[PDB]
Structure formats: structure tokens, C-alpha cells
Amino acid sequence: ATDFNRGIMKFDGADSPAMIAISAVLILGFIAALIWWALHTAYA
């Protein structure tokens, strides 16, 4: 986590558990939304 916070990717509070949790639910919820949408919108 500290090895990712160096140089260009350097943001305060990026490896915090609250930010990791909200980014996790955002990313993986868009994954699950895209998968459910593909199973529903696309036919075959």
C-alpha cells in the first residue's frame, strides 16, 4: 500500500480503509451492474 503511494500516484488518504471500502463498492458494484445488465439487456 505504501509502495503505491510514491511519485505520480501520491494521494493522501488513498490506502485508508474507508476510501478503499467506498471505491470497492463503487467498482465492484459497477461490475455486478454491468453483468446483470448484460444478462438482462442483451439476448443470447
Identify what 41 binds: another protein, ligand BCR, none; CB under 5 to 8 Å per kind. another protein
Q: At a CB cut-off of 8 Å and minimum separation 6, what does 39 contact? A: none
- State the cell numbers at 6: 510514491
- Give the binding-site size for ligand BCR (rule: CB under 6 A): 3
Question: What's the distance, CA 43 to chain centroid?
Answer: 27
Site map 2..41 versus ligand BCR, x via CB under 6 A: -------------------------x--xx----------
Q: How far is the CB of 34 from ligand BCR (least distance, A)?
A: 6
